[PDB]
Write a protein that binds this ligand. Structure first.
Ligand code: BCL
Ligand code: BCL
Ligand code: BCL
Ligand code: BCL
Ligand SMILES: CC[C@H]1c2cc3[nH]c4c(c3C)C(=O)[C@H](C(=O)OC)c4c3nc(cc4[nH]c(cc(n2)[C@@H]1C)c(C(C)=O)c4C)[C@@H](C)[C@@H]3CCC(=O)OC/C=C(\C)CCC[C@H](C)CCC[C@H](C)CCCC(C)C
Ligand SMILES: CC[C@H]1c2cc3[nH]c4c(c3C)C(=O)[C@H](C(=O)OC)c4c3nc(cc4[nH]c(cc(n2)[C@@H]1C)c(C(C)=O)c4C)[C@@H](C)[C@@H]3CCC(=O)OC/C=C(\C)CCC[C@H](C)CCC[C@H](C)CCCC(C)C
Ligand SMILES: COC1=C(OC)C(=O)C(C/C=C(\C)CC/C=C(\C)CC/C=C(\C)CC/C=C(\C)CC/C=C(\C)CC/C=C(\C)CC/C=C(\C)CC/C=C(\C)CC/C=C(\C)CCC=C(C)C)=C(C)C1=O
Ligand SMILES: COC(C)(C)C/C=C/C(C)=C/C=C/C(C)=C/C=C/C(C)=C\C=C\C=C(C)\C=C\C=C(/C)CC/C=C(\C)CCC=C(C)C
Ligand SMILES: [Fe+3]
Lengths: 301, 280, 238
């Protein structure tokens, strides 16, 4: 058998890479963590360094508060018994306030207040982390793509628990923090709105989700098939096209009639995925606020 | 008809069957024995779908729908109008998919690249064959397979899912959904990365793979590497499909009850099975 | 209703995105040409995009695409039929002439630079702090060809510094001269290194580099292209 380049045959290690500097505040960067021989066979072996910063910490803190706040509640339902906790870990749940309380923060802790507490922490955690992925790129002088593509995910997240519950009149329409319970919520959201398979955005969402999985398979497999010509070095293959990007382009032209460029394929990649939560966000926002049943709508449009 | 850098690549050879007989192109499309093979299987199949359109009495795409034999026919053949067409079309679809794959192989041999593409395609080929071939044959009737209709096949999904309650509970389905969601997050990133590098703020210079690796170490404390993210992408994908095919081969064969009840094996563990409190 | 307005506005948006994406992918290769090299009559529905300029780091100038397309090299091929679409045959040694699976591109004759302007790929003997930290160490192992005959030995591993990764194996030949084999085309085994693409007698053919401490984009392409063409062209010996 020939070599497939899935796992490296020989690892090589040198001095820990402190990374580029540019306008980064080197006082916030931690110290290079260890080297993993494990991860080495697959990707880079170097863990760290990581950049902390004020925003990094605010987020990381909110993040644990959100995680602990839920857990305090799970232990509560487990009667502080370690065996129960482990046994029903999947069934516990932090439900939102009841319908009565509407959009107020008045609800008692034991019936949705604790949910509001948590969500607050999660609301801070997320956005702050967004800010972070924007500032880190600015420090390095790179484009804001990662920050923008992250917004797309924030979009759906925002609709599901904030935007939609506000437009409905109650925090009771948001998602509960629980493994099995948030699955149950999903199933209900479909039934109540007349089967989401009739929602055209949901239909499109699935298109891209499947598409993203098609595309990476394609892109991945491709770059590995011409790695033997230095394909993974995309950026320099952008500025100076090599035999790698040509054969790559030609395999797909000959196959399905058309192809991409070493820079273009990424523009496809970035959108294909971004649209998943883009269309999905819309689809969920128009559910219950404008369209009560997607089957009925599906009959008249 | 050619790309500015194409000619030098259009050389003879590489075919698996038929030497130089079909070794030629038509516009951008490369042909090859298998180029032909799928045209045959594709057209014949289309014809049959069109013929099953007249037997149903409609030409609307959103209504056409080729259904399989009824559970009464077992794994035998059936009359064209009552599942016999679906069975031949299925033979034709598989003939096209397979051929297409093999066609990509001959295109690789000519370009001297690796067989990663047609290898990754074989994974979708597998998913499909699980639904229309392996699951039915193990259950005992072509009827458990899905119909070829734009919406009718969505129903099949919806009906097949709710047969076992909330399908969400199938454990392999949960594993497969993870890989899908991940694989998208991943593709979203890898594409934004390579672009935020080649397209830096206005005026500045193209960044280097060094700034990429940097950028992520600062963000999450780790960078898989340009050869790694492409291995990962290829892996999150094929896996999400592997687990998907798996989550269905076990549904209706080794397990046919509500999926949500399968989770009792965990809660009914001697150690805590009786301890009071909690949810159970 | 609002929903109907939403989905339509979307399919409109989606068609403009498909338009945008497709043209972006036409920066290279276009405009198309006939087999004779002259511009083709039909270029498709999509137009060429407006030129964009990349300012390459380390004062290496700029790149504008789309731009004037030229192979900047000779193509030793000839037509095999009187009409379009048929294979073009190599008039010489496909391997030596650089055609088909052995094709290479005339990339800049400069080596790729890391973030700080230092050569990306260096032999390991001149790479400070780098060593083999896992797996078998190829260095010192005899290299075999697809014909099961020994063609040389490994005398060093060329590495990619910024990404810490093995990219080439410097091999010494019977005549004391070295060549580079792409890591990706060799199978490092316990007691040897097997190269399936080429046969013994073809190793001497592999294009050589001008400096002994660096490889230039061009040179990489020639080497990789040569080793890969062996797959199809060596075959009579493999
Ligand atoms: C995976 C589990 C279910 C299933 C569940 C769903 C669900 C759930 C949804 C779909 C949806 C779709 N499914 Mg499905 N689907 C299944 C199996 C198949 C098979 C097959 C050969 O087995 C095919 C061809 C399809 C095809 C399709 C698309 C028509 C549509 C999604 C767009 C998309 O982006 O797709 C991903 C692929 C790409 C982006 C690549 C481009 C491929 C194009 C889109 C193919 C068009 C085919 C055309 C309509 C059929 C032509 C046949 C002629 C004879 C040539 N499905 C299995 C049985 N499918 C979505 C929809 O909107 O439905 C109404 C949707 O919500
Ligand atoms: C029985 C129930 C219904 C149904 C009900 C729903 C409902 C209800 C919804 C979906 C949604 C989706 N459905 Mg559905 N769906 C059904 C059947 C299907 C089938 C199928 C083959 O049958 C398929 C392929 C899909 C596919 C999909 C996706 C396209 C889409 C979600 C995209 C996504 O990535 O979200 C995941 C992405 C996010 C949640 C993004 C936000 C993430 C945030 C920003 C990150 C937080 C991080 C946290 C703080 C950090 C954790 C990490 C730490 C290290 C611990 N559905 C059935 C018919 N589906 C969603 C949608 O958008 O629909 C339009 C949705 O609301
Ligand atoms: C889009 C429609 C629905 C929805 C539908 C589903 C469905 C359907 C499924 C999930 C599943 C999952 N969902 Mg969800 N989910 C929604 C919204 C969320 C919200 C937040 C919205 O803002 C979050 C964070 C989650 C998070 C999660 C994960 C805990 C879990 C998937 C693993 C994964 O690969 O994640 C992607 C994220 C990463 C790869 C990065 C971070 C890694 C995470 C933290 C790993 C979690 C591991 C888990 C705790 C393992 C336990 C096993 C131990 C042996 C005990 N969902 C919306 C409302 N979700 C799957 C599951 O298995 O559930 C039980 C599943 O089948
Ligand atoms: C209400 C129904 C149930 C449910 C019931 C089912 C059922 C039933 C099935 C799935 C399956 C899947 N479900 Mg579900 N599912 C539910 C809810 C969800 C949710 C959610 C957030 O709620 C999510 C994310 C998912 C996600 C998923 C996917 C992991 C998986 C389908 C992908 C796949 O197999 O592709 C694989 C890809 C293929 C099969 C296609 C193969 C394509 C072929 C090779 C090529 C075709 C080419 C074409 C003809 C060419 C056209 C050419 C023209 C020129 C264009 N489900 C609900 C709870 N789900 C399916 C699965 O696991 O399948 C194995 C499945 O059978
Ligand atoms: C097309 C949209 C797709 C997408 C894109 C996407 N996601 C993104 C991005 C993008 C483009 C980012 O840039 C951002 C990122 O940073 O990626 C590396 C991110 C991100 N996507 C995430 C999740 C995510 N994305 C999802 C989906 C998707 N993301 C879509 C498929 C999902 C699903 C499928 O539900 C999830 C769960 C986050 C991991 C990450 C953003 C991180 C964030 O918001 O963090 C706030 C911080 C916390 C909550 C910290 C606490 C975490 C745990 C509760 C505690 C345990 C861990 C902790 C490290 C322990 C510390 C212990 C101490 C002792 C030290
Ligand atoms: C890891 C697996 C992932 C993957 C990979 C993948 N797909 C691939 C490849 C790869 C690596 C290709 O090389 C190949 C390609 O050429 O892509 C451009 C392809 C491809 N993936 C395709 C589709 C596809 N992939 C999907 C999924 C996936 N593909 C996975 C996510 C899906 C989903 C999500 O359902 C679809 C629809 C094709 C566009 C393309 C292969 C094209 C091909 O084989 O064409 C010739 C075939 C015909 C002309 C067949 C017609 C056959 C019959 C005569 C009629 C139709 C019968 C059918 C049953 C009708 C169904 C109708 C539906 C409404 C139900
Ligand atoms: C970096 O490198 C890379 C490239 O380039 C350098 C690339 O281009 C690509 C792939 C290219 C793209 C442009 C990505 C685009 C995005 C997609 C989502 C593509 C998949 C979706 C499609 C809708 C494509 C359409 C698919 C097909 C199969 C069209 C085929 C059309 C026909 C009419 C069939 C022809 C029929 C037969 C039978 C063949 C033989 C023909 C005869 C006439 C006989 C990748 C992955 C890559 O990683
Ligand atoms: C081992 O034990 C310890 C003690 C260490 C802790 C263990 C913790 C455990 C076991 C935690 C388990 C938690 C789990 C499994 C949580 C799962 C959550 C899931 C599956 C889904 C979440 C869905 C939530 C989304 C939809 C939430 C969106 C929230 C928002 C958009 C923000 C909402 C904003 C509000 C209410 C207003 C706040 C105020 C303003 C206006 C700024
Ligand atoms: Fe890439």
């Amino acid at each position: 058998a020939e070599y497939q380049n899935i796992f490296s045959q020989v690892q090589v290690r040198g001095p820990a890479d402190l990374g580029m500097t540019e306008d980064v505040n080197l006082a916030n960067r931690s110290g290079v963590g260890p080297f993993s021989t494990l991860l080495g066979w697959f990707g880079n072996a170097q863990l760290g360094p990581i950049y902390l910063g004020s925003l990094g910490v605010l987020s990381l803190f909110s993040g644990l508060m959100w995680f602990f706040t839920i857990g305090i509640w799970f232990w509560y339902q487990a009667g502080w018994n370690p065996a129960v906790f482990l046994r029903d870990l999947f069934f516990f749940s932090l439900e939102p306030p009841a319908p009565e309380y509407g959009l107020s923060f008045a609800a008692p802790l034991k019936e949705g207040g604790l949910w509001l507490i948590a969500s607050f922490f999660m609301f801070v955690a997320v956005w702050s982390w967004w800010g972070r992925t924007y500032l880190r790129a600015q420090a390095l002088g790179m484009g804001k793509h990662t920050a923008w593509a992250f917004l797309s995910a924030i979009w759906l997240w925002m609709v599901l628990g904030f935007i939609r519950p506000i437009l409905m009149g109650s925090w009771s329409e948001a998602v509960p923090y629980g493994i099995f319970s948030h699955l149950d919520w999903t199933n209900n959201f479909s039934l109540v709105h007349g089967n989401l398979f009739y929602n055209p955005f949901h239909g499109l969402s699935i298109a891209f989700l499947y598409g993203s999985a098609l595309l990476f398979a394609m892109h991945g497999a491709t770059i590995l098939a011409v790695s033997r010509f230095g394909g993974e070095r995309e950026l320099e293959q952008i500025a100076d096209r090599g035999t790698a990007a040509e054969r790559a382009a030609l395999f797909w032209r000959w196959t399905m009639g058309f192809n991409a460029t070493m820079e273009g394929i990424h523009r496809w990649a970035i959108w294909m995925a971004v649209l998943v939560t883009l269309t999905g966000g819309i689809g969920i926002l128009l559910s219950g606020t404008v369209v009560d049943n997607w089957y009925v709508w599906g009959q008249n449009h | 008809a050619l790309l500015s850098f194409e000619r030098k690549y259009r050389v003879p050879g590489g075919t698996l069957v038929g030497g130089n007989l079909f070794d030629f192109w038509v516009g951008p499309f490369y042909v090859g024995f298998f180029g032909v093979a799928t045209f045959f299987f594709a057209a014949l199949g289309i014809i049959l779908i069109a013929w099953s359109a007249v037997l149903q009495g409609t030409w609307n795409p959103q209504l056409i729908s080729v259904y399989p034999p009824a559970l009464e026919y077992g794994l035998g053949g059936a009359p064209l109008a009552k599942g016999g067409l679906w069975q031949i079309i299925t033979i034709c679809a598989t003939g096209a998919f397979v051929s297409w794959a093999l066609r990509e192989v001959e295109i690789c041999r000519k370009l001297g690249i690796g067989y990663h593409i047609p290898f990754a395609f074989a994974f979708a080929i597998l998913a499909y064959l699980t639904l229309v071939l392996f699951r039915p044959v193990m259950m005992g009737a072509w009827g458990y397979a899905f119909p070829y209709g734009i919406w009718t096949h969505l129903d099949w999904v919806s009906n097949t899912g709710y047969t076992y309650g909330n399908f969400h509970y199938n454990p392999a389905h949960m594993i497969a959904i993870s890989f899908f969601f991940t694989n998208a997050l991943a593709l979203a990133l890898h594409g934004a990365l390579v672009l935020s590098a080649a397209n830096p703020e206005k005026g500045k210079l193209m960044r280097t793979p060094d700034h990429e690796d940097t950028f992520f170490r600062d963000l999450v404390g780790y960078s898989i590497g340009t050869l790694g993210i492409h291995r990962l992408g290829l892996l999150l994908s094929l896996s999400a499909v592997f687990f998907s095919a798996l989550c269905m081969i076990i549904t209706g064969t080794i397990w046919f009850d509500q999926w949500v009840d399968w989770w009792q094996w965990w809660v009914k563990l001697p150690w805590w099975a009786n301890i009071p409190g909690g949810i159970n | 209703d609002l929903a109907s307005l939403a989905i339509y506005s979307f399919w409109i948006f989606l068609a403009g995105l498909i338009y945008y994406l497709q043209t972006e992918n036409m920066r290279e290769g276009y405009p198309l040409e006939n087999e004779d090299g002259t511009p083709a009559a039909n270029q498709g529905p999509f137009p060429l995009p407006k030129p964009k300029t990349f300012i390459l780091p380390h004062g290496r100038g700029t790149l504008t695409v789309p731009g004037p397309e030229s192979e900047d090299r000779p193509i030793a091929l000839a037509r095999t039929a009187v009409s379009e679409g048929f294979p073009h045959a190599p008039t010489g040694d496909p391997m030596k002439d650089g055609v088909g699976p052995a094709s290479w591109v005339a990339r800049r004759d400069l080596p790729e630079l890391d973030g700080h302007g230092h050569n990306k790929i260096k032999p390991m003997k001149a790479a400070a702090g780098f060593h083999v930290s896992a797996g078998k160490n190829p260095i010192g192992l005899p290299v075999r060809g697809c014909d099961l005959e020994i063609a040389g030995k490994v005398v060093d591993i060329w590495v990619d510094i910024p990404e810490q990764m093995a990219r080439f194996l410097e091999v010494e030949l019977k005549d004391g001269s070295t060549r580079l084999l792409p890591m990706q085309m060799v199978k490092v085994q316990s007691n040897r290194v097997h190269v399936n693409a080429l046969s013994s007698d073809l190793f001497a053919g592999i294009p050589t580099i001008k400096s002994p401490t660096e490889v230039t984009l061009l040179e990489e392409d020639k080497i990789c292209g040569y080793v890969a063409g062996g797959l199809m062209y060596a075959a009579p010996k493999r």
